[PDB]
Amino acid sequence: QAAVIELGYMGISVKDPDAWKSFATDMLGLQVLDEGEKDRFYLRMDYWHHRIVVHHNGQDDLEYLGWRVAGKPEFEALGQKLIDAGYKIRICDKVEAQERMVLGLMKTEDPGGNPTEIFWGPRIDMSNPFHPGRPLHGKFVTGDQGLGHCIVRQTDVAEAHKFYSLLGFRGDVEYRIPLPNGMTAELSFMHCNARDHSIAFGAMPAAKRLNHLMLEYTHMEDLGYTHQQFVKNEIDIALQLGIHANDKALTFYGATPSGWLIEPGWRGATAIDEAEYYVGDIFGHGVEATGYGLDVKLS
Amino acid sequence: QAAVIELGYMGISVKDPDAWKSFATDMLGLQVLDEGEKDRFYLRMDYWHHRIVVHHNGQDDLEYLGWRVAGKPEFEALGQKLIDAGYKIRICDKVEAQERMVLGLMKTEDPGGNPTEIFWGPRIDMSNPFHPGRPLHGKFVTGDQGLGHCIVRQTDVAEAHKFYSLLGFRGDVEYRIPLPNGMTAELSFMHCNARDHSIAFGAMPAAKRLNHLMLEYTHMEDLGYTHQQFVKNEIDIALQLGIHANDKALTFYGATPSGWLIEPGWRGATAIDEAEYYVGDIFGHGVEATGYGLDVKLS
Amino acid sequence: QAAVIELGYMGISVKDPDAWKSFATDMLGLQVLDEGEKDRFYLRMDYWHHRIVVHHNGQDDLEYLGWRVAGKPEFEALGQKLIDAGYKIRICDKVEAQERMVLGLMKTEDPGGNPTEIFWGPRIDMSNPFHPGRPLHGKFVTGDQGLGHCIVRQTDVAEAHKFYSLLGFRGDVEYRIPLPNGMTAELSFMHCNARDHSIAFGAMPAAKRLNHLMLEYTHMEDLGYTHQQFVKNEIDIALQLGIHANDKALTFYGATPSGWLIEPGWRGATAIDEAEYYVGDIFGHGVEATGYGLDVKLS
Amino acid sequence: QAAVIELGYMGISVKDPDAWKSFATDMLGLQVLDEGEKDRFYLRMDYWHHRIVVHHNGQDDLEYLGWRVAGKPEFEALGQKLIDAGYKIRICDKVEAQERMVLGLMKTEDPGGNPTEIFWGPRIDMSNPFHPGRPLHGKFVTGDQGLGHCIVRQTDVAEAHKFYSLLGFRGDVEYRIPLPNGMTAELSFMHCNARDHSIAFGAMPAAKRLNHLMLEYTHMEDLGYTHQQFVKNEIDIALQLGIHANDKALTFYGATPSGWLIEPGWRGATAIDEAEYYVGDIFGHGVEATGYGLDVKLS
Amino acid sequence: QAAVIELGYMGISVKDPDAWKSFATDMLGLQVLDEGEKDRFYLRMDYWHHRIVVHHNGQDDLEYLGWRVAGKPEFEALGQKLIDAGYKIRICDKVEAQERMVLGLMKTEDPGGNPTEIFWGPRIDMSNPFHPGRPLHGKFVTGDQGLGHCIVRQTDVAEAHKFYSLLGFRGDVEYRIPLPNGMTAELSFMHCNARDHSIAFGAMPAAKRLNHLMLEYTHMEDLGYTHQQFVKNEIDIALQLGIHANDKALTFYGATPSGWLIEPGWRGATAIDEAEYYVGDIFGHGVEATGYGLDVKLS
């Protein structure tokens, strides 16, 4: 059955490109690639030409998520599936596909308004191995798991679930978290490969499309050094170190120059098709810096 | 689903059979088998009776590619599939099948005019283990991967892709290579088993059906010795040693007595169903000898 | 898809039960189980209550082959498949099923006239571990591979193939063996599990239903001792020690007291779905004693 | 502790070099190497320049056994050990060492009169991989196990044992075999590496220094084919196929053109330091052709 | 027994430090570390503070080899062993040890005049992971194998062998290579850990202490890219790509800015204690650029 197989790339727009270059390299160990374009640069994690496009003169938010399918037959099948179900899509011409450096490209929006791209045939620069922006003990976990995961804004969880399910994702409510005001927040997490989740959401108020992006190190030492960099440089940590009940990953959440959060992590477990839920994390992920997309403790 | 499972055998015709015997044995380590026929001999690589038929009084080009299916049910299913799709096929009688030493045989041509045979039931001489034409450290990689791969001539890539897809192959454009004249050459690569590719093509001008045949050694030492044989004997090397971005194989391309190229290699990676593309090889495969099927550098 | 999964049991009839008890125990290492019945006894190989039923006052030939399916749903599906295709079957009542010690039983004949039973739910005596009729270094290869294999008589190979294919077997002509008279004998071999073949046949003249039964030792030492027993006791060996091209097993063929052959063996390879053929065995299996079901050399 | 580590090479002399070339290649699969010397040629089994030197104008017997030590320090230590114990040795000059193609060489005789050489630094031709004299499924077992083993003549087992023990071998009486005349033959077997034995002997009357040489195939198929070659060509088999109780190897013993026996085999077990004994082999090794070094059955 | 366990560090002096920084980073992928010292900088390969010290205002040759022992007890034992055998050593004070960044240090010269240091307790910067001077697919092989190997000048091979044997190395003559003038060059290779050799030499005329330094990549792709860098930048290659008979490594030899050779390589085999010799390499290592420390082909 035709399905999305990974979060292949994403685009963000920023107001301060120079701050983003220093942040990405020094704080995270990502590689900056500048192709001489006036309005954008790239961040690499592996052999792909890029994983993140960073657009200038921007909004400090997500621009697009790029979801990969295996090839042209799955691209065509999924496109027709979306059309048959009543979703509005546009099949892109050669110029637009070349902009993203993919062989085939279609554009749509998810039910929450998040620009969503489906593509086949990423550009891989095997001649240009990843070279991190600071020394690293290891590298990033990508491969069959794609670049990482995001929590994005939604207005109707059922509608969002319908859309991502059509795309081949699996998952449902995995957390029922008590809120300070007596309500219970339901968070849904969906997978499309071995990464425990690639997309997640609730129907929570949010000023930005993007709540956080999670990037995963192969080595615990790089995660620890990254955490220390945030502390040393007095960068806000919204949720402190902890371990998630679903994916078993060791992570924290820190501010980016755009105000949405980065979640550096290590040791994510394999996705499971069998739905379960929790009322909190294993421990940690307590609130430190207030006033971010995540103001409430997870355990 | 019924599908081609390997490149089982191939036939070539040559103007100089004696030169071909010395080339195949000394330069490559293939085994010559002469069954006393006036007009042909065989080259072996493994337990199969043969992998290559070498016809005399010839054209210095490919005569046929022989694609294996698992058995009679898949043979019949694929035959009917070709007929239903409007392709012209001929089901061969016992005499023609016996000529190829197979249990069932059908003949057609691919959209580029390359004679294409589909068969089941190869003859295996378990009593006669491979005995290479020169001493070898190892042997050849065949088995589930078939004999090797070819690049062949096509006039319409989309039509070629349709035909091979019907036969059960998977793959698409994997290289977009800049050409000296400012154009971009698109090369497509298709697999039917664990070998990264078994057939590949672009819509490129070509005097011969066959651009090159790739044969894979189990041992790096045999590849190195083969490379040294080409250098020592001053045989043209069209593309020097390098590593492909798609299959990760260490290979070079040298002249055969027929003028098309042999690509001896080592360390091919497992095929992947997920389409990606590159703008060049990892490195190497630079042009040395000019005037062959490949005049342009691959990295 | 519903299919036969193993040769579960078989029945033979004999004129000399006492000779058969001594032969089975001393020459082969099978276990004799006598349940006090006037007209039969059993031979064991493993935890099954039995693998071979030996009927008295007999014909020195095969009485029935018992083919297992996984359970009742597959039994019912296969029964209906046979009926729909025009084959005559009888679904057995409780008394007949109890005679065979199975939970469900149907009876038919293959196109060559060989009585064929299909059943589910064999009786396993876990409380009664196999105890061989002579000391053994090892045991027998059974399990997922069933008891062994037989070559049986057929009058029309295509009809036989159709029947066994309906039952879920796979396989075709694997040998084209030159005969002394200038003809070529075609032998077909079919599998229904990991055993390289469980049933095989050609359209060859035969006085008996059963040409041979093959039983496989886990240990080479037991095969060698068995071979030595045949030599020491001057029991006819029709085909001497050799190795088959298809299953790679080390075997010989010796006379039983019933005149059909036993093929003791060791080291059978895993079945393959990809059809190939040979013109002889790896070596050995030359003719020694003449006048048996196999009078012609296999290599 | 300084010790012999393998049977590295051996020398034989023959009356019929041409018969020996055909025998070694066709019957055994050894590689003939002729360096243009008037009086000798070589047999190869692996990457070593050679394992067996075949001298012309000879006696149809063993000329020397060449025992390897790890290096110069062990060579010197063992030389001094032999001198201290009262054995007569000669340290060879450069010319004599070069004849054997070794870096250091000493010559002596064992207590039975068998010329015995101790050396370090064999010549290995890594550029020249083994190329068998007939097609082989596999190759030979050499490496840490050396070339094979011999039974040689002795007049005093205790004296022989003392000598080989000084050289670093371990082992003792492993067989007490009943003889037709009512006596019991004691055979001793000694190891110096993982090969179950490299040298063995009893105090038995013998016209030749060499009773037999055992060579081990990696693949059972090559052993079987070799056995079939002896049968087909009507070459005397002194002891038929069987399995040894000590090393668990499948072997037979056949005549060479020199009248002493070759023991082709397969599946030798790892040497053990713990002494045990047997009164016969597992089975087989019965007498067929009479009048050879071995006239008595082993089981 | 106390012994040297690896080539831990080395010092070189150069006339052109800027050329060396560009060469080391771009051509080899080494990491430049400048600690602000006026007269030296460092090259890193791994977590060690450094592996190579590069001194300014120099002689374009080796300054010292630094051989590690396990700890203080082995340092003291080896020091006393050298004194007892009549070698001149100096035990260094704290200032000299701190210069090398080691816990204990002694200085001597080998019999060929090559400055030789023995130390315990290297400085490891676990906080500062290796960051190569160009992007790399992999990293370097160091660890238990130390930094690499050198061939250095000697005037008396027996004396050199005595010295290195006292230090705990093992090895002897491994090559007897025919020279153009009819002589035979003997080369000796010694190991002190799993690296096939760490030091090697003959008694050959040489203008420099250092003939070559070998550095080993984990990944074949980095070796290939390095080879391509030498070709592209028209840097002299003295011996072309080939494989050594002793260590089985794929290597070539290229000019450094100091005129002695670097030998980049991949796939070195484990050292063996059993001495063997060869008359050439497996193949390759033919002469290209003349006028370097190696003017003669190795195969």
Ligand SMILES: Cc1ccc(O)c(O)c1
């Ligand atoms: C900000 C921006 C710039 C270019 C694009 O193609 C896009 O999608 C967004």
Ligand SMILES: Cc1ccc(O)c(O)c1
């Ligand atoms: C919500 C939104 C609107 C426009 C943008 O360019 C963007 O990144 C986000």
Ligand SMILES: Cc1ccc(O)c(O)c1
């Ligand atoms: C907890 C949360 C915060 C912001 C979001 O956009 C979301 O989907 C969930």
Ligand SMILES: Cc1ccc(O)c(O)c1
């Ligand atoms: C649950 C799961 C695990 C691994 C996968 O590759 C996948 O698609 C789903």
Ligand SMILES: Cc1ccc(O)c(O)c1
């Ligand atoms: C592994 C670990 C250690 C300390 C923490 O506070 C935590 O959340 C996790």
Ligand SMILES: Cc1ccc(O)c(O)c1
């Ligand atoms: C509650 C939760 C679980 C896993 C995540 O990756 C995350 O961001 C939040």
Ligand SMILES: Cc1ccc(O)c(O)c1
């Ligand atoms: C040249 C040639 C000869 C015989 C054939 O069967 C064939 O296909 C081609």
Ligand SMILES: Cc1ccc(O)c(O)c1
């Ligand atoms: C193009 C072509 C035509 C005829 C042949 O026999 C051949 O090998 C090729």
Ligand SMILES: Cc1ccc(O)c(O)c1
């Ligand atoms: C690059 C190339 C050259 C010749 C061909 O026939 C082809 O398909 C591709």
Ligand SMILES: Cc1ccc(O)c(O)c1
């Ligand atoms: C991609 C792939 C890998 C292995 C196979 O056997 C196959 O058919 C396809």
Ligand SMILES: Cc1ccc(O)c(O)c1
């Ligand atoms: C492994 C390797 C070594 C050298 C080369 O030039 C190359 O292309 C590959």
Ligand SMILES: Cc1ccc(O)c(O)c1
């Ligand atoms: C560009 C390319 C990649 C892989 C191949 O086998 C080949 O011949 C060419």
Ligand SMILES: Cc1ccc(O)c(O)c1
């Ligand atoms: C001879 C015989 C006896 C009983 C049976 O049930 C049978 O099938 C055959």
Ligand SMILES: Cc1ccc(O)c(O)c1
């Ligand atoms: C052919 C045949 C007929 C009756 C039997 O009982 C039997 O075993 C065989």
Ligand SMILES: Cc1ccc(O)c(O)c1
């Ligand atoms: C060779 C052979 C002999 C007897 C048979 O019944 C058969 O099917 C095949």
Ligand SMILES: Cc1ccc(O)c(O)c1
């Ligand atoms: C070819 C094959 C191998 C194993 C099996 O279990 C089977 O049913 C078929």
